Amino acid sequence: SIQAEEWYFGKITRRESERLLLNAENPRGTFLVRESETTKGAYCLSVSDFDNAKGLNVKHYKIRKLDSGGFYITSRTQFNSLQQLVAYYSKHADGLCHRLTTVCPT
Numbered sequence: 001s002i003q004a005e006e007w008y009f010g011k012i013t014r015r016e017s018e019r020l021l022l023n024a025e026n027p028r029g030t031f032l033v034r035e036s037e038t039t040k041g042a043y044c045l046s047v048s049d050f051d052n053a054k055g056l057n058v059k060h061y062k063i064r065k066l067d068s069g070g071f072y073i074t075s076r077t078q079f080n081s082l083q084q085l086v087a088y089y090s091k092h093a094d095g096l097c098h099r100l101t102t103v104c105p106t
């Protein structure tokens, strides 16, 4: 159950995800997963970042889910569940702006 997950914010808008993530107290990698605004069946991983060029900012990554079963951001790297995907990206930055660190505070 992905809805049981504390990092799953469900049906919130992209603007709302940015409002929650653009809090000065959020370190790099603060994140949440929400439904995509327009892609049916896809989730969206919203992640905070920070650098001297952009300062505090937010990145969004589409998470696909196949009827065939797998969840992924890139088709080359798939998982059996959204939870496993989140766990993998909490250890590997790979192509993301930062590895996932802590769940976005309400």
Ligand SMILES: *C(=O)c1cccc(OC)c1OP(=O)(O)O
Pocket: 014, 035, 036, 037, 038, 039, 042, 043, 044, 045, 060, 061, 062, 063
């Ligand atoms: C996720 O689906 C996603 C990925 C990349 C960019 C955006 O919006 C900027 C995004 O959020 P969405 O709700 O528009 O799909």
